[PDB]
């Protein structure tokens, strides 16, 4: 229950919430009304969840791109600033928060990504993304790195993906055609493929996230990084001598980062809409107000004419403005969340190798047009389901060691002056190592007609699934009996789940992907023994058919009974 007479405010953890708190103290020193600032995790989703239950904070902070959907849901109260107040803020920043002709929030400051380099390590930073692989070679020779930026959020990679032609929604005659997406076009594949080549060529790691990139850069390890104004504070207090400049160009074209406007919205179910207006219009959106917040963490180009004008003489801000001009201001429509999840998923999978650049973006083209949902929420949820299910399997002993029915097969190959005939049969077949199969990566979710579909991967990586067994084959007059051990590398399972509106999780599909490779160790026989090649080829073949199948038929049931136990 939103407490009346008090002000609860939410802002992102990477912003100057400590400074925002001080402004909250002054408000309390003048009105007696306490202001509490909190920076929850996943607030861009937490808010719409609690605010939908008629609860939440009185004021929520975030880039305008999210607010479109918030307002659509009726979670945001229409702001009421006098024409005189609007006048003291740049018009374009009001357009940013205008949804359906109504102003649904107060703009705070414009923010754009810029290139951040180490003056000492790199006095003159590269002007293009292409001359970066070369620069990495040099730095590596000195135990350094060329570039490190968050690859877990599509917000940071998008600048490159759009550079050559990528785009979210086609804007036409004052309207964003939610059907005309542009993430898998020629211009987009070029960018993502480039980004992927950087990882394939080990110039950067896919696992790299915000904190890892920040630590390396501020530690002096990497020469460059890509971040926003908020990031400057931590670099200031580091030892790194830094500069902020124009992002690298791609194919003679500038990187087009999505520009966002940090906005403050008032929760519709708030009983303190007047106290909220006071705070925002007369305590935060003042030169003294924005300064307190800015000292803690730079806001970028504030929407307040007076202050934006004062800090406009900052080289770093001058850079940010340059990047903003080259890129475009994000649309605020509700479909924006889908767009983000789609791209976020395409980038992550393409960078991890889970999907090829084409497969990823094609799926993003589709997903960006699906029914927006609390992705994170549902993802963590489904992962949790599979995990516990897989952990249950780990308990049973029926699958590890997994007994496998014998098998016999006849073959032949015209080897010389003989249509070489001969067969062999396997006994005491046992699969091992399936007790260590975890979930690889997040569940890739999508919602259609109210039903959620999820695709996952369960496998035994950084380990091996061996199948030991007694073998016997016929070679002319030789009837040898030995023991074999076939190792399978990269054992993977493709899962397909479906969560009904009733909340029922039913297994859609289950298949053991064909083994990337199989290394047969035939006892007493050497890889140099001419026969090995034939036997190995046969064993591996019946492995990719018989074994792999009678392995799926045994794991499919166990995965159904679990993913559908508590089901109902
Ligand atoms: O990565 C997708 C994400 O991008 C934007 O979020 C930014 C935000 O604008 C910045 O102020 C800062 O907090 O970094 C965020 C990236 O993690 C969009 O505003 C957001 O909706 C979107 O999910
Ligand atoms: Na802080």
UniProtKB/Swiss-Prot annotation:
The Gene Ontology terms for molecular function here are: carbohydrate transmembrane transporter activity; maltose binding
Keyword Transport on this protein? yes
Where is it found, in Gene Ontology cellular component terms? ATP-binding cassette (ABC) transporter complex; ATP-binding cassette (ABC) transporter complex, substrate-binding subunit-containing; maltose transport complex; membrane; outer membrane-bounded periplasmic space; periplasmic space
User: Where, subcellularly, is it found?
Assistant: Periplasm
Gene Ontology annotations of biological process type: carbohydrate transport; cell chemotaxis; detection of maltose stimulus; DNA damage response; maltodextrin transmembrane transport; maltose transport
| Induction data | Induced by maltose and the transcriptional regulator MalT. Permanently repressed by cold shock in a PNPase-dependent fashion.
Q: Which UniProt keywords apply?
A: Periplasm, Signal, Sugar transport, Transport
**InterPro entries this protein is in?**
Maltose/Cyclodextrin-bd (IPR006060), SBP (IPR006059), SBP_1_CS (IPR006061)
A Pfam family it matches: SBP_bac_1
Family assignment from sequence similarity: Belongs to the bacterial solute-binding protein 1 family.
| Primary role | Part of the ABC transporter complex MalEFGK involved in maltose/maltodextrin import. Binds maltose and higher maltodextrins such as maltotriose.
Q: How does it assemble?
A: The complex is composed of two ATP-binding proteins (MalK), two transmembrane proteins (MalG and MalF) and a solute-binding protein (MalE).
What is the protein name stated in its UniProt record? Maltose/maltodextrin-binding periplasmic protein
Species of origin: Escherichia coli (strain K12)
């Amino acid at each position: 229950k939103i407490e009346e007479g008090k002000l609860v405010i939410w802002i992102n953890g990477d912003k100057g919430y400590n400074g925002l708190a001080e402004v909250g103290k002054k408000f309390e020193k003048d009105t007696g009304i306490k202001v509490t600032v909190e920076h929850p995790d996943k607030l861009e989703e937490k808010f719409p969840q609690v605010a939908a239950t008629g609860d939440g904070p009185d004021i929520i902070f975030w880039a305008h791109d999210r607010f479109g959907g918030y307002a659509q849901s009726g979670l945001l109260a229409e702001i009421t600033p006098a024409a005189a107040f609007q006048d003291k803020l740049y018009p374009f920043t009001w357009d940013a928060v205008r949804y359906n002709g109504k102003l649904i929030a107060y703009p705070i400051a414009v923010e754009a990504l810029s290139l951040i380099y180490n003056k000492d390590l790199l006095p003159n930073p590269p002007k293009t993304w292409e001359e970066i692989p070369a620069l990495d070679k040099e730095l590596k020779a000195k135990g350094k790195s060329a570039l490190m930026f968050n690859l877990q959020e599509p917000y940071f990679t998008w600048p490159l993906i759009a550079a050559d032609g990528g785009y979210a929604f086609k804007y036409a005659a004052g309207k964003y055609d939610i059907k005309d997406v542009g993430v898998d076009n020629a211009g987009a594949k070029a960018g993502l493929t480039f980004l992927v080549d950087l990882i394939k060529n080990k110039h950067m790691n896919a696992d790299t996230d915000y904190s890892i990139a920040e630590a390396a850069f501020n530690k002096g390890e990497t020469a460059m990084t890509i971040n926003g104004p908020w990031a400057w504070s931590n670099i200031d207090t580091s030892a790194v001598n830094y500069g902020v400049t124009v992002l690298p160009t791609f194919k003679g074209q500038p990187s087009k980062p999505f520009v966002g406007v940090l906005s403050a919205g008032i929760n519709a179910a708030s009983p303190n809409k007047e106290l909220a207006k006071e705070f925002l219009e007369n305590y935060l959106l003042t030169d003294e107000g924005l300064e307190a917040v800015n000292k803690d963490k730079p806001l970028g180009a504030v929407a307040l004419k007076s202050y934006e004008e004062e800090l406009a003489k900052d080289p770093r801000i001058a850079a940010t403005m340059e990047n903003a001009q080259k890129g475009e201001i994000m649309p605020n429509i509700p479909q924006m969340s889908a767009f983000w999840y789609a791209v976020r998923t395409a980038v992550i999978n393409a960078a991890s190798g889970r999907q090829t650049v084409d497969a990823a973006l094609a799926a993003a083209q589709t997903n960006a047009a699906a029914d927006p949902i609390h992705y994170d929420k549902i993802t963590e949820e489904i992962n949790k389901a599979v995990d516990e299910a897989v952990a249950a399997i780990e308990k049973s002993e029926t699958f590890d060691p997994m007994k496998v029915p014998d098998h016999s097969d006849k073959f032949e190959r015209h080897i010389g002056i003989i249509d070489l005939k001969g067969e062999l049969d396997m006994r005491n077949i046992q699969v091992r190592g399936l007790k260590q199969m975890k979930r690889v990566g997040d569940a890739n979710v999508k919602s259609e007609d109210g039903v959620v579909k999820a695709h996952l991967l369960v496998g035994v990586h950084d380990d091996v699934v061996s199948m030991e067994y007694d073998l016997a084959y016929k070679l002319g007059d030789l009837h040898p009996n030995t023991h074999v051990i076939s190792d399978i590398q990269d054992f993977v399972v493709e899962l397909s789940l479906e969560v009904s509106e009733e909340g029922n999780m039913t297994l859609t599909s289950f298949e053991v992907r064909q083994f990337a490779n199989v290394v047969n160790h035939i006892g007493g026989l050497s890889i140099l023994d001419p026969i090995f090649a034939v036997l190995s080829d046969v064993l591996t073949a019946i492995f990719q058919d018989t074994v792999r199948a009678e392995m799926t038929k045994v794991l499919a049931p166990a995965f159904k009974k679990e993913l559908e136990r508590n089901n109902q």
